[PDB]
């Protein structure tokens, strides 16, 4: 992530796949997603397919998979309340408060 050279990243995953340490290749991709810029993660995807690094890496870097992962923490231990919505109609005037 500091270097921000897409060519460097593609090379680490390639070597771990060839060794048949797929797991290792996989970890760097989820770790990379959190910190890195999105533009930077997008460039990797194009380069990985071509080397022939497995398809698995591609999903997590996309950022489609990551949302679902967060959902289980939020959904399980989810607080909600209707009451605030109602407080704004009845109590105060609605425009400033409403937003």
Partner 1 sequence: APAVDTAEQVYISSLALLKMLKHGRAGVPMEVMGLMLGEFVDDYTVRVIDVFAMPQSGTGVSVEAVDPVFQAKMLDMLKQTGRPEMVVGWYHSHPGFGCWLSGVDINTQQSFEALSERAVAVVVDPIQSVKGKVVIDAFRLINANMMVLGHEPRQTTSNLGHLNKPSIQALIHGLNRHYYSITINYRKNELEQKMLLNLHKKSWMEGLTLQDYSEHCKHNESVVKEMLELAKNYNKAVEEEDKMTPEQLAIKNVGKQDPKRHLEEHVDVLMTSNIVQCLAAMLDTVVFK
Residues at the contact surface with partner 1, assessed by CB under 8 A = 93-97, 99
Task: Please report where in the chains the tokens 């607080």 appear, as a residue.
Answer: 79
Question: Radius of gyration (Cα) for the chain, nearest Å?
Answer: 21
Nearer to partner 1, 46 or 94 (CB): 94
Least distance between partner 1 and beta carbon 28 (Å): 46
CA distance 58 to 9: 13
Least distance between partner 1 and beta carbon 85 (Å): 17
Nearer to partner 1, 74 or 91 (CB): 91
């Amino acid at each position: 992530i500091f270097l921000d050279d897409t060519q460097a990243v593609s090379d680490i995953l390639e070597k771990l796949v060839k060794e048949d340490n797929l797991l290792m290749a996989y970890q760097i991709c989820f770790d990379l997603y959190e910190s890195a810029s999105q533009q930077f993660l997008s460039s990797v995807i194009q380069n990985l397919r071509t080397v022939g690094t497995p398809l698995k890496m591609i999903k997590i870097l996309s950022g489609e998979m990551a949302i679902e992962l967060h959902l289980q923490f939020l959904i399980r231990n989810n607080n909600t309340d209707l009451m605030i919505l109602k407080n704004t109609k009845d109590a105060v005037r609605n425009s400033v408060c409403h937003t």
